[PDB]
Amino acid sequence: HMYYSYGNYEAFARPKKPENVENKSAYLIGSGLASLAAACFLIRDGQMEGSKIHILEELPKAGGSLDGENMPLKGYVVRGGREMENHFECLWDLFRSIPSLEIDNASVLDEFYWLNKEDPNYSRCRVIEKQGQRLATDGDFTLTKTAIKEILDLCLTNEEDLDDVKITDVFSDDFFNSNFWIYWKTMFAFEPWHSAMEMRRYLMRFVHHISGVADFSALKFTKYNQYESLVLPMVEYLKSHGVQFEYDVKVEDIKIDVTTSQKIAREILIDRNGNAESIKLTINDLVFVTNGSITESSTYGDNDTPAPPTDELGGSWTLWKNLARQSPEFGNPDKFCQNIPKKSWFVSATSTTNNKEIIDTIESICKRDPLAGKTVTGGIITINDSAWQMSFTINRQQQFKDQPENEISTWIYALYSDVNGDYIKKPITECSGNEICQEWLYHLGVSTDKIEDLAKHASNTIPVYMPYITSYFMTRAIGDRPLVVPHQSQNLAFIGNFAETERDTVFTTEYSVRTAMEAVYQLLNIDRGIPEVINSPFDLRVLMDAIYELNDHQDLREITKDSKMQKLALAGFLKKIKGTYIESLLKEHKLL
Amino acid sequence: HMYYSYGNYEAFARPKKPENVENKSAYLIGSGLASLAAACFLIRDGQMEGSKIHILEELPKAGGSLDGENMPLKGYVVRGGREMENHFECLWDLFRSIPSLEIDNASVLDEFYWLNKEDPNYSRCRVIEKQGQRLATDGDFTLTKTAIKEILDLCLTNEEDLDDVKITDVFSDDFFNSNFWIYWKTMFAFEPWHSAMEMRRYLMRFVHHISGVADFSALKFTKYNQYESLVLPMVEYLKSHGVQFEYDVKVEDIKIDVTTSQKIAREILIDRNGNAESIKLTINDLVFVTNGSITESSTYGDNDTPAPPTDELGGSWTLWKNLARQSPEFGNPDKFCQNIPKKSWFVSATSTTNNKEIIDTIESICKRDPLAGKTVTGGIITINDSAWQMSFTINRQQQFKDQPENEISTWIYALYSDVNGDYIKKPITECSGNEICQEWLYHLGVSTDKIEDLAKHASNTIPVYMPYITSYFMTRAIGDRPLVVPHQSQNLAFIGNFAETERDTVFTTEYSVRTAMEAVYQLLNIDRGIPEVINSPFDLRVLMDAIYELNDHQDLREITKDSKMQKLALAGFLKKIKGTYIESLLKEHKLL
Numbered sequence A, B: 001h002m003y004y005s006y007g008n009y010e011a012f013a014r015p016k017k018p019e020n021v022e023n024k025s026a027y028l029i030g031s032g033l034a035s036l037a038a039a040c041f042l043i044r045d046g047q048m049e050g051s052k053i054h055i056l057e058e059l060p061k062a063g064g065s066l067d068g069e070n071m072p073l074k075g076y077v078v079r080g081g082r083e084m085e086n087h088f089e090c091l092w093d094l095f096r097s098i099p100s101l102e103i104d105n106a107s108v109l110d111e112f113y114w115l116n117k118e119d120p121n122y123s124r125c126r127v128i129e130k131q132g133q134r135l136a137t138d139g140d141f142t143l144t145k146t147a148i149k150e151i152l153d154l155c156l157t158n159e160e161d162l163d164d165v166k167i168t169d170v171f172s173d174d175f176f177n178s179n180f181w182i183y184w185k186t187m188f189a190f191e192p193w194h195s196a197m198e199m200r201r202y203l204m205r206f207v208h209h210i211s212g213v214a215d216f217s218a219l220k221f222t223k224y225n226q227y228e229s230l231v232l233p234m235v236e237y238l239k240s241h242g243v244q245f246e247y248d249v250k251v252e253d254i255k256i257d258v259t260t261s262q263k264i265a266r267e268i269l270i271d272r273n274g275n276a277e278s279i280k281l282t283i284n285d286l287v288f289v290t291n292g293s294i295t296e297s298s299t300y301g302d303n304d305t306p307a308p309p310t311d312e313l314g315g316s317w318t319l320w321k322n323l324a325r326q327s328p329e330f331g332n333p334d335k336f337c338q339n340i341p342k343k344s345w346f347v348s349a350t351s352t353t354n355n356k357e358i359i360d361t362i363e364s365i366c367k368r369d370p371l372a373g374k375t376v377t378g379g380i381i382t383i384n385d386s387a388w389q390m391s392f393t394i395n396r397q398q399q400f401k402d403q404p405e406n407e408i409s410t411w412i413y414a415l416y417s418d419v420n421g422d423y424i425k426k427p428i429t430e431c432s433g434n435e436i437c438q439e440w441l442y443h444l445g446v447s448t449d450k451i452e453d454l455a456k457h458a459s460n461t462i463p464v465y466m467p468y469i470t471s472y473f474m475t476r477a478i479g480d481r482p483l484v485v486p487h488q489s490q491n492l493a494f495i496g497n498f499a500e501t502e503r504d505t506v507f508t509t510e511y512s513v514r515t516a517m518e519a520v521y522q523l524l525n526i527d528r529g530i531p532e533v534i535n536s537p538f539d540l541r542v543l544m545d546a547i548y549e550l551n552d553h554q555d556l557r558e559i560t561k562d563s564k565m566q567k568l569a570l571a572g573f574l575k576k577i578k579g580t581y582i583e584s585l586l587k588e589h590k591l592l
């Protein structure tokens, strides 16, 4: 009930009012980015009455995983950071229509575009080691021929043949020893046991940005945290259109008839203010389920208390489990929320400080004044030789509108959770905020004498334990994620980064916007094209650049210089294409 | 002073106000589509004051080659028809901002998009012969292996090696005997002696539409003629912004200093109301020259008088000639406006009638009621065995808002001008309107008894002799067309279908919009990306579809079934790619 498109024609075109939409209502389980984007699309393109749009949230506030607040009895905390790129096609379709809350007569897209042109993002230091020294080979990928061939063979493998395959199953030691693996696994938070299918999707989806993977030149960021820059403008727009925010309501089940001909949502069983109630649904009441959550059951610590580890299934995962009992076409949540290894990423941390010594130590590494208000680290700095495999970033300060001008807040995360640290020789899951800050300051090169004092009394570090933060990337098979609109579904859609759609990559905001938009368009039969995932993996020019970049800026003669079986094929093919447009294209892209 | 881009990010983004634009003015030579589009871009993105924008036109009305009027003392006349496609990226960037004059709160793009979704364009009869019989092989391309190989070898030839090369120089008899050549040469008005470079550009530019070349399923049309649907909305927008239309002013020269460091336009020498005057220019007065015109020196006939042939250089060609004397970087107009062969297309015709016999004869061929207001012929019908190589179309009737509801107007053109017709055994350039109508009705299958009466007294046919209508496609070399902004030019730009820009194809409205937009962006340093020409020739999927379609829907096994040198290579390559994503892609596109 939809079609994919690309180009300006379908981008600038407005859809006609969908049929019978004046007699339809919408209920969105959750208030993360997916549900908010779907509500926005229901307003703009579906032309649905705002009062007929119900957003059900269990927390006190909207946003979801794009949070960012001065949590009372703690401090400033951002559960993550949002790297963004130009080719978030659906997200930019969305946010060009959302008024910015910072610039008059300007969209969120306008503010973002002008900002990332004023202060472009780039890293002057990406990988450090030995307590604050930049990696000597920072910039190069250092991939052997076997590692490059393994990358290509992963891309050349059909997705259908990658069910439950792990990343270590399709890569050997040269790849894991390469700088490429450092950059890739830290900027995308991949683990060695994660889904090779999703890694292949990532390789094909961002292949146009390989030249900017090491220096983060392809990344783009908002001014503030994603709650103030993305969530609040969207919420203001939706409220100005009368959208119905219902807070502190927990959905436990959705009664759905799965017949031989239809799948129809009949009832929303909810818990509002401790009272178990029911929402009866007709065929004209669409339900958008954000199945699963990476932030569910998050616990919080403080400067002197670790965030208590948990294995608790919340409302999101129990709701997906309850929906899976009604049809296998609704997915298998256990593949994502169970058997998460102990080593997996769990803990994030936000360390706030105004101390000049820490800020100056950061300036000495990132080469930029962290209080200047512009780019600081340009993205995560990775401590290569850290036992926790730790990375940290400082975005444009301050990430909060009402943060003091002399403060900075640093986001820290670790890929390995069950390993003794190098300074604090305990696993990160047993560390308070100041202890994470201590282990972090140790790798900055701070003198061991000052580390403990500067961490405990000069910094306020809030830690966060998310038991499902790596859940997106767990090894999966085709069918474990429900289709955005399952077969014969009449009024039920699955959105968010656990739904199934082609080619696009999860753990991205664009995936949420895409699933929201596809769900709305399919359920309402909106007569407008959906922007396909950008066609970079099919672009000959982009693939030529990929070959040039993966081989550390070498032409075809240098790549094949160490084998006769390579040299002969290259010479024959070159004579075959001599003096043609193919040769000119290869020369234009530095491959000849 | 510009960059190319693609995707929604740069499409929806607005540019900041360009620097120092409040102290700048603009003068546009001509009022065709290029000048109007450039004025629109100066208003919207350059944010230039409308009163500082001067559009100089020598004719009484604006529009140029997009005309369409009830010419007094004659009849209805459209000098041509405008086939359009979805991937006119720059044009759709433009017209999404131009308010439609037919639908409230809707752009021209909105009206066009909704209309071509309501009444999609497709032909139920494309090629006829033997006085009104549909070609038996209508639909198939009927290309031999040699013809397909010649097409690919033209595409694989560097553009730089195609200077002054003719189409007959890179094609043999199989290609010219193919139905592909019929469709291609008639829908694009290519002649055998025309530029092979431009034919290669056409092959690469519309390769995504090969599946819809025979039935015109990829074409899209406005509601009315291009003067009422495109020109009038643009003019209304520009006037609502205070743009300065100066009519009946003929530019004869532009005094330009071409120094070792700069090219600066100093003076506009004009003839306004018979008075020779001068317009002094500073560096902040940009000049946009529409160098050359395909409609210049057009003569008109009537039902009983031929359009008098002419070789006269008008104001456009003499102005381009005068500019060429000042620098070779400004092009060589003589390559386009001299040595036009006698055989070339010169004559168009608009035959209007309300006679039921002619309309019913048309319904019997095109299978649609020509007075229904929807699609009629879906594009040009080509009379294959006509000596004039004649084609004709009937767009959605009526093409004029104030045309009687019982009338239709048919556009007719002929590729060969110096050949005796099959019924009227004179060349078309010696035929009155009714005589062209007679030769046309003869190929419809009208009984010879009624042809002459129905043409002379039941129809009103206006003919038009354009000595330069084929000028776009004349054999050219790199440098014969000036760059949109020549090197070191400070305030001079060349727009229209005789300027030079990469990859895009001339004889298209999109080329005019593209040159206008690139000129404005380069001269004003507008901080927004220009949409590149659509990347279809670099898209692996599109190229696979091209292979499948050119070979008349055959997979790789059928294509290679008649040679061992083909079979062996195919079998080896297939075993090399067996069970991979390459094999799956080839199967998805029906090549395996």
Ligand SMILES: Cc1cc2nc3c(=O)[nH]c(=O)nc-3n(C[C@H](O)[C@H](O)[C@H](O)COP(=O)(O)OP(=O)(O)OC[C@H]3O[C@@H](n4cnc5c(N)ncnc54)[C@H](O)[C@@H]3O)c2cc1C
Binding pocket: A029, A030, A031, A032, A033, A034, A035, A056, A057, A058, A059, A062, A063, A064, A065, A066, A079, A080, A081, A082, A083, A084, A249, A250, A251, A252, A290, A292, A293, A294, A295, A315, A316, A317, A319, A348, A469, A495, A496, A497, A506, A507, A508, A509, A510, A512
């Ligand atoms: C650490 C981290 C790093 C990130 N990095 C990036 C990055 O680099 N790039 C990028 O593009 N994006 C990034 N993201 C964003 C990521 O894509 C998020 O998933 C994004 O916010 C999408 O939100 P969502 O609505 O799809 O899911 P969520 O934000 O998880 O939505 C869940 C919401 O639904 C509510 N909910 C769940 N179940 C119920 C129920 N039964 N009843 C009521 N309410 C319920 C929850 O309370 C919550 O508000 C990151 C996120 C995190 C947490």
Ligand SMILES: Cc1cc2nc3c(=O)[nH]c(=O)nc-3n(C[C@H](O)[C@H](O)[C@H](O)COP(=O)(O)OP(=O)(O)OC[C@H]3O[C@@H](n4cnc5c(N)ncnc54)[C@H](O)[C@@H]3O)c2cc1C
Binding pocket: B029, B030, B031, B032, B033, B034, B035, B056, B057, B058, B059, B062, B063, B064, B065, B066, B079, B080, B081, B082, B083, B084, B249, B250, B251, B252, B290, B292, B293, B294, B295, B315, B316, B317, B319, B348, B469, B495, B496, B497, B506, B507, B508, B509, B510, B512
């Ligand atoms: C027969 C025909 C078929 C076509 N088919 C198609 C098609 O299939 N698809 C498509 O996309 N487009 C088509 N077109 C449109 C084509 O691309 C036109 O060139 C288009 O209108 C672009 O206009 P332009 O402003 O670039 O050139 P023009 O329209 O030629 O602009 C010239 C204008 O400038 C004026 N002028 C010139 N010199 C001077 C001077 N010295 N002083 C003052 N005024 C001057 C002229 O009077 C005229 O108004 C067709 C056009 C014709 C005529």
